Design a protein around this ligand. Structure first.
Ligand SMILES: *[C@@H]1O[C@H](CO)[C@@H](O[C@@H]2O[C@H](CO)[C@@H](O[C@@H]3O[C@H](CO[C@H]4O[C@H](CO[C@H]5O[C@H](CO)[C@@H](O)[C@H](O)[C@@H]5O)[C@@H](O)[C@H](O[C@H]5O[C@H](CO)[C@@H](O)[C@H](O)[C@@H]5O)[C@@H]4O)[C@@H](O)[C@H](O[C@H]4O[C@H](CO)[C@@H](O)[C@H](O)[C@@H]4O)[C@@H]3O)[C@H](O)[C@H]2NC(C)=O)[C@H](O)[C@H]1NC(C)=O
Ligand SMILES: *[C@@H]1O[C@H](CO)[C@@H](O[C@@H]2O[C@H](CO)[C@@H](O[C@@H]3O[C@H](CO[C@H]4O[C@H](CO[C@H]5O[C@H](CO)[C@@H](O)[C@H](O)[C@@H]5O)[C@@H](O)[C@H](O[C@H]5O[C@H](CO)[C@@H](O)[C@H](O)[C@@H]5O)[C@@H]4O)[C@@H](O)[C@H](O[C@H]4O[C@H](CO)[C@@H](O)[C@H](O)[C@@H]4O)[C@@H]3O)[C@H](O)[C@H]2NC(C)=O)[C@H](O)[C@H]1NC(C)=O
Ligand SMILES: *[C@@H]1O[C@H](CO)[C@@H](O[C@@H]2O[C@H](CO)[C@@H](O[C@@H]3O[C@H](CO)[C@@H](O)[C@H](O)[C@@H]3O)[C@H](O)[C@H]2NC(C)=O)[C@H](O)[C@H]1NC(C)=O
Ligand SMILES: *[C@@H]1O[C@H](CO)[C@@H](O[C@@H]2O[C@H](CO)[C@@H](O)[C@H](O)[C@H]2NC(C)=O)[C@H](O)[C@H]1NC(C)=O
Ligand SMILES: *[C@@H]1O[C@H](CO)[C@@H](O[C@@H]2O[C@H](CO)[C@@H](O)[C@H](O)[C@H]2NC(C)=O)[C@H](O)[C@H]1NC(C)=O
Ligand SMILES: *[C@@H]1O[C@H](CO)[C@@H](O)[C@H](O)[C@H]1NC(C)=O
Ligand SMILES: *[C@@H]1O[C@H](CO)[C@@H](O)[C@H](O)[C@H]1NC(C)=O
Ligand SMILES: *[C@@H]1O[C@H](CO)[C@@H](O)[C@H](O)[C@H]1NC(C)=O
Ligand SMILES: *[C@@H]1O[C@H](CO)[C@@H](O)[C@H](O)[C@H]1NC(C)=O
Ligand SMILES: *[C@@H]1O[C@H](CO)[C@@H](O)[C@H](O)[C@H]1NC(C)=O
Ligand SMILES: *[C@@H]1O[C@H](CO)[C@@H](O)[C@H](O)[C@H]1NC(C)=O
Ligand SMILES: *[C@@H]1O[C@H](CO)[C@@H](O)[C@H](O)[C@H]1NC(C)=O
Ligand SMILES: *[C@@H]1O[C@H](CO)[C@@H](O)[C@H](O)[C@H]1NC(C)=O
Ligand SMILES: *[C@@H]1O[C@H](CO)[C@@H](O)[C@H](O)[C@H]1NC(C)=O
Ligand SMILES: *[C@@H]1O[C@H](CO)[C@@H](O)[C@H](O)[C@H]1NC(C)=O
Ligand SMILES: *[C@@H]1O[C@H](CO)[C@@H](O)[C@H](O)[C@H]1NC(C)=O
Ligand SMILES: *[C@@H]1O[C@H](CO)[C@@H](O)[C@H](O)[C@H]1NC(C)=O
Ligand SMILES: *[C@@H]1O[C@H](CO)[C@@H](O)[C@H](O)[C@H]1NC(C)=O
Ligand SMILES: *[C@@H]1O[C@H](CO)[C@@H](O)[C@H](O)[C@H]1NC(C)=O
Lengths: 123, 436, 132, 120, 436, 28
């Protein structure tokens, strides 16, 4: 689960394998069953939130029409107002961390546009 | 065009509930360690570490939330442990104390009224001076006037054990492996781990005990070296070995304070009375201060450095206050730090049984006797020091004077836990491409 | 959020985009608002209930083969004894609420038939087709 | 959870129903609606959280195998007779299916990832 | 080829919470009975049950975890219910008693805890001999030397109601719906139920009250007849009716002992004083003896069967402990278990108020008195018996002897929960085929 | 919750009461 400093191209190549490990379960197999009053309530809160995060990612991808897939090509065009950089430099000079920070303030917008454009697919 | 990628290796800063881990010692001696909640998972055998190439991260030990979490966890555990133990309020009655080095141990007799028969029972016990306050030479226990005193429960050990902190699933811990990290800033050679190294939750006020050592040199870290109100944490690259003992051959007595509970005190002492002294090798200590002064000269103006004694009149600040076996030692360290750097050691100690642990005022903890001849040893791995600074005098001093310092007890953890930072993984994002 | 004073036909013309707002509301946004035994255990219980309800609906769409679908058609015929009305009365005179009430008594029958056929008889047929 | 045919439902007759898969993730909702005191309350809440977590773990595994949308999923993995075999008529006419557990928990226990990683 | 299926009807042993149940009876002022705190919706009328054809399962009742769960549920509920009630330790003071049925009732004078307002007051209460211990006529409450005695809250009912246990999602309860099941092994008419039948949580040592009845005839169900250290749990056919009376007309006093702490006691007995007793009438339990005869061949070969006396010396074991009202009876069962066979009667009863429930030494419950004239009746449905272990003889006895025996309350419930086993469902699995 | 001896200070709207303290610390 390394190559964090690698470029987006390098890190996304074979994203799927890396993703299977990340997505083997949030807790993998229920903390690989290794872990199977206040301490108790704090842990229930932690476990519930882990479940919500899992489901939220799956739900959002499903809304966008990306299910059973890790990489999805959508109906929303890139707006240069979000970022106006050469396609090549973001993919081979920038890392994913740098990229996510670069467009962090457009996250809500892009996601909202994806839900509207992906929902409007006849269905 | 927007393409959605899931499984992307990106993290953001986060603060979360942490998990414990510990060795499955399974002593099963009918004594539970207080650290009974430390076994939420066994220590992972063969833990892994992955170096992240070309990752630079900012670490801030002074704002580290794992340090704050450790504090909350230790307080919570202590309160749970003491909660069900016997109250000692029946012992707040007036005491009649006489002598048993003079006046250090006193023989106090009293009238106890909670005996089952509800008729007065005369009882006596030996106490150390620090727990007895004058109120015609009548006495009372030192904390009865303000708080509830509870006896620590028999069969519960408070021995520090190594504890490893582990990330909750969905989180990761980044470790700083840079050399001479020092603080508040970028770190290279950042690696990802699941669990931290073990940290022993040892509590002391001046000399840090049984910690990790610096790999190459003595390292001095501070949030601000010009702000004279800040604590300087000094990590040593070699441990100074310290021995200590309380030789009085104590024999324990048990008082039937309540139907279901017994109160334990020293009944008598067999043989001679001696001070609970500690022993530090002179050579190692002196060489350690030499090295600290050298590093301080590099950090500060390259001028003369002196180490002075404890300031203030508060025992938890001025003395060492470490926990040895079942006893609380309050050692006099003014013997140390009495020199100027321009280029065996015996420490007397006192024993105190009623402890205002963590400086809480609702309750105090009482430490029962442990049958005499208690011996322990430990490693001095670092110091908590402050610079005195001073008033704005007209260049009246060419020497920077430092003193032992204490209080808070957060630096006891920060000094080792600082290498770790918590982040959350958010493996979802988008990027431009050629698409539909 | 919706209308529901409209007839089934009119209301459903936008189901493609009304749906995926109701769905979104179940998991997203509220959980950002909430990032802060009276108001303790109760909130934890509320979170758990929302998750349980969510999964129930997704599981049924899955068992019936409507995976990722908002509108899905299957092999189970309508039994005319249920709401024995013309197609137009059902779609253009009645609203969704009125409709669900009228056939509330047949819900169990409909669901059992959907499970027996879709993805059940249908998947035994697929195992046979994939034998070659 | 009628389990009709749980024992000797041929084996193949069990598979014409598979109707008990809608209970573990659903009946709990009904139980909570009927209910709608920490001595019992925390334990009951823990039970609810666990039931959800177990459900999701099975769904995640079906996802990795590429079986999440199916109740019956044929994967591209040959059966390994060195673990266990008998004729298919016995397998399909007489259900127990426990003889396979030690070996399969490792064979398919590993293959689910190998299969998907090397699928194409 | 491997095919994976997700609705496979298989299961494994598992443990969990069983929710709770009640009949939703109105609370009827007072308080909700403690058992009525089980605020679960009553199992829907006509609970679901499905017979599983071809199912064989091993219902080893001696390892049934539902027994342990019921045990924990009762201990826990009782402690939570007694926890906040009035403490009676102010009454452990020496009493002056005047002895007023052979002195069973004593009139005892208090010298200390006699007034809430400051006064040197004197006060009186009546006590039963069983709760008073000698220390001229100087007495104290029997358990004060070691324990804390609390008064059960006068408003709280602990009266049993039928309780059903139910499975959580993912679990199922397998019912051994067969005839003459002996407690272990196969019983091949297994049905699955959503919940169990209701069982009243009645605790009564030697004679089991208000249980289910044997179907067809009496069964023995021992764990191992050749193991002398085992209990035999006998379920009886039909039933026996027992009528218990405490024929005394009391009054109530309420003494303010400490602020907000009221002690509820007996004032005076109106009319004559009479011994408590239970009636059994001409019961011929010869069919139990015939079941023994069937198992007699294992139990020392064919021998004369005797039940001549209750022994061991401890009233908690020796006498029948019976809960009639808010008061507890200790009845001498010697008049029932006296006869031997080849191959109205009354039990005098004593009354006790300080109960060392479940041998939780260090704690005890005080049962405040009832208003007066209590009469109750109950059904005898089973017996807890032990066989005298074989002696180191030359195999000369022609008779075997059995006695009422017990005291381990879990055996009271093994008799009802024997039909149920808890398993979890594992719907995911694979099988070989020939496809893609 | 002990006996009070009240002397007052509409008349006795406000009661001036002499109080014996259940001792909080010293049991005297
Ligand atoms: C506080 O208390 C501690 C005790 O709790 C006390 O500790 C002593 O400290 C001194 C000074 O540091 C140590 O002395 C040094 O020892 C070096 C050799 O150490 C090894 O060999 C020891 C010898 O015994 C072995 O061999 C003999 C002969 O075959 C055999 O009979 C024995 O059974 C045994 O096998 C051995 O005891 C020692 O093991 C201890 O220490 C290790 C490490 O901490 C620990 O893991 C063990 O469990 C055990 O406790 C180890 O194996 C020696 O090289 C060194 O020499 C220096 O000086 C010479 C010049 O004289 C130079 O030429 C040389 O290069 C070095 O610079 C020195 O002699 C002593 O060993 C400690 N004792 C113990 C029991 O640990 C502290 O001093 C006390 N402090 C105060 C202030 O009072
Ligand atoms: C402990 O105390 C209990 C009381 O709490 C006591 O119980 C009695 O036990 C005796 C002996 O077994 C019973 O006697 C038998 O009665 C059989 C007839 O039962 C029916 O008729 C009863 C009387 O009817 C009158 O009253 C009704 C009132 O409503 C009226 O209509 C009628 O016209 C008539 O006037 C009736 O009470 C009984 O009711 C049942 O249901 C109610 C429901 O609420 C329940 O409360 C009752 O307890 C009872 O279950 C029913 O309708 C009779 O056939 C039988 O005789 C045959 O068998 C004997 C076997 O020995 C043979 O010897 C004989 O030759 C016959 O073949 C016998 O007479 C009596 O009914 C019980 N109940 C009462 C209230 O008295 C226990 O014995 C006490 N135990 C101990 C150890 O002390
Ligand atoms: C103070 O610091 C010193 C130096 O780090 C500590 O010494 C170390 O103690 C451990 C435990 O006894 C030694 O580990 C053992 O080594 C033997 C081989 O000799 C191996 O067989 C055992 O399984 C185990 O790994 C370690 O080697 C030793 N370090 C050195 C340099 O000698 C000392 O314990 C510290 N004191 C306190 C109180 O913590
Ligand atoms: C086991 O269950 C089956 C039904 O699943 C019962 O019914 C018979 O099953 C056999 C084996 O498949 C068939 O050959 C018969 O034709 C079935 N009977 C009828 C009337 O159709 C079977 O009786 C059950 N066995 C036991 C011991 O309970
Ligand atoms: C003792 O057993 C009797 C007989 O079984 C119980 O009384 C009746 O039980 C039958 C079922 O066998 C019911 O149909 C009747 O309605 C019951 N009658 C009454 C008045 O309850 C009786 O309840 C049991 N317990 C006691 C204390 O008598
Ligand atoms: C990346 O790594 C190389 C090799 O160690 C080093 O020379 C370079 O300075 C690093 N760059 C950054 C931004 O860390
Ligand atoms: C205290 O003890 C001494 C004996 O050591 C005795 O003479 C003295 O009277 C005692 N004082 C009180 C107040 O009990
Ligand atoms: C009484 O007070 C005097 C003056 O402080 C002191 O010397 C004397 O010892 C006291 N009495 C006792 C019993 O301590
Ligand atoms: C980075 O940390 C690893 C930890 O195993 C260490 O082996 C390596 O030498 C370190 N590299 C640098 C440049 O510090
Ligand atoms: C600690 O640092 C000093 C100063 O650089 C050095 O002389 C000494 O050898 C180091 N100690 C150890 C144990 O490496
Ligand atoms: C303490 O003084 C009492 C007299 O009040 C005496 O009986 C007792 O033995 C003394 N305690 C010791 C340990 O000498
Ligand atoms: C240590 O002992 C000296 C003796 O002269 C004393 O002045 C100093 O205050 C003591 N320090 C502490 C912390 O007790
Ligand atoms: C500590 O401070 C005092 C102040 O009076 C001074 O006399 C003494 O020399 C100082 N000691 C050191 C080691 O600086
Ligand atoms: C006990 O009560 C009797 C009542 O006749 C009375 O005479 C006697 O003095 C009392 N004894 C005590 C110790 O109070
Ligand atoms: C006990 O007897 C005395 C007379 O000796 C009487 O005044 C008192 O009321 C009696 N107490 C009780 C509880 O009956
Ligand atoms: C006290 O009671 C005993 C019997 O336990 C009796 O023998 C004795 O004479 C009584 N003493 C008095 C003074 O009444
Ligand atoms: C199995 O149980 C059902 C339900 O009680 C019963 O009707 C049936 O006769 C039983 N079958 C056998 C073989 O005992
Ligand atoms: C019961 O039998 C034993 C011999 O096994 C005998 O010692 C005892 O006295 C008898 N008890 C009664 C009440 O018959
Ligand atoms: C209350 O009464 C006391 C005497 O009991 C008196 O000293 C005090 O002044 C009175 N308080 C007020 C407010 O008058």
């Amino acid at each position: 689960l390394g190559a964090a400093g690698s470029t987006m191209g390098a890190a996304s190549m074979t994203l799927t394998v890396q993703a299977r490990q990340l997505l083997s379960g949030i807790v993998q197999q229920q903390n690989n069953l290794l872990r199977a009053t206040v301490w108790g309530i704090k842990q229930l809160q932690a476990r519930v939130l882990a479940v919500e995060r899992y489901l939220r990612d799956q739900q959002l991808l499903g809304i966008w029409g990306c299910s059973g897939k890790l990489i999805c090509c959508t109906a929303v065009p890139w707006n240069n107002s979000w970022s106006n950089r050469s396609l090549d430099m973001i993919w081979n000079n920038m890392t994913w961390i740098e990229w996510e920070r670069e467009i962090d303030n457009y996250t809500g917008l892009i996601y909202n546009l994806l839900e509207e454009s992906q929902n409007q697919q006849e269905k | 065009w927007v393409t959605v990628y899931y499984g992307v290796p990106v993290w953001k800063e986060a603060t979360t509930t942490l998990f414990c881990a510990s060795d499955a010692k399974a002593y099963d001696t009918e004594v539970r360690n207080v650290w009974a909640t430390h076994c939420c998972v066994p220590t992972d055998p063969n833990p892994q570490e992955v170096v992240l190439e070309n990752v630079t991260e900012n670490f801030n030990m002074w704002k580290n939330d794992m340090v704050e979490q450790m504090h909350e966890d230790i307080i919570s555990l202590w309160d749970q442990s003491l909660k069900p133990c016997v109250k000692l309020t029946p012992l707040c009655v007036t005491l009649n104390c006489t002598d048993y080095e003079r006046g250090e141990i006193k023989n106090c007799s009293f009238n106890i009224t909670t005996s089952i028969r509800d008729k007065v029972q005369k009882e006596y016990a030996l106490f150390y001076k620090l727990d007895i306050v004058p109120i015609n030479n009548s006495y009372r226990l030192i904390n009865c006037n303000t708080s509830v005193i509870k006896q620590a429960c028999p069969k519960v050990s408070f021995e520090p054990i190594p504890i490893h902190y582990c990330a909750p699933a969905g989180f990761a811990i980044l470790k700083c492996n840079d050399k001479k990290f020092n603080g508040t800033g970028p770190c290279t050679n950042v690696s990802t781990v699941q669990c931290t190294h073990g940290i022993r939750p040892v509590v002391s006020t001046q000399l840090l005990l049984n910690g990790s050592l610096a790999e190459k040199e003595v390292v001095i870290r501070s949030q601000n070296f010009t702000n004279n109100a800040k604590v300087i944490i000094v990590q040593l690259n070699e441990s100074v070995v310290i021995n200590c003992t309380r030789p009085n051959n104590n024999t324990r007595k048990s008082i039937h304070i309540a139907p279901g509970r017994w109160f334990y005190t020293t009944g008598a002492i067999i043989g001679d009375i001696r001070q609970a002294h500690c022993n530090i090798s002179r050579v190692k200590w002196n060489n350690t201060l030499k090295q600290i002064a050298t590093k301080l000269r590099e950090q500060f103006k390259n001028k003369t450095i002196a180490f002075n004694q404890s300031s203030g009149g508060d025992p938890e600040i001025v003395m060492h206050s470490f926990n040895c076996g079942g006893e609380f030692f309050y050692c006099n360290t003014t013997q140390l730090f009495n020199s100027t750097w321009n280029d065996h050691i015996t420490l007397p100690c006192r024993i105190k049984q009623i402890i205002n642990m963590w400086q809480k005022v609702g309750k105090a903890m009482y430490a029962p006797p442990i049958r005499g001849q208690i011996r322990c040893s430990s490693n001095i791995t670092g110091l908590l020091l402050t610079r005195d600074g001073g008033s704005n005098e007209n260049k009246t001093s060419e020497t920077e004077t430092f003193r032992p310092a204490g209080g808070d007890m957060r630096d006891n953890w920060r000094s080792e836990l600082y290498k770790y930072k918590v982040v959350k993984i958010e493996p979802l994002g988008v990027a431009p491409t050629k698409c539909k």
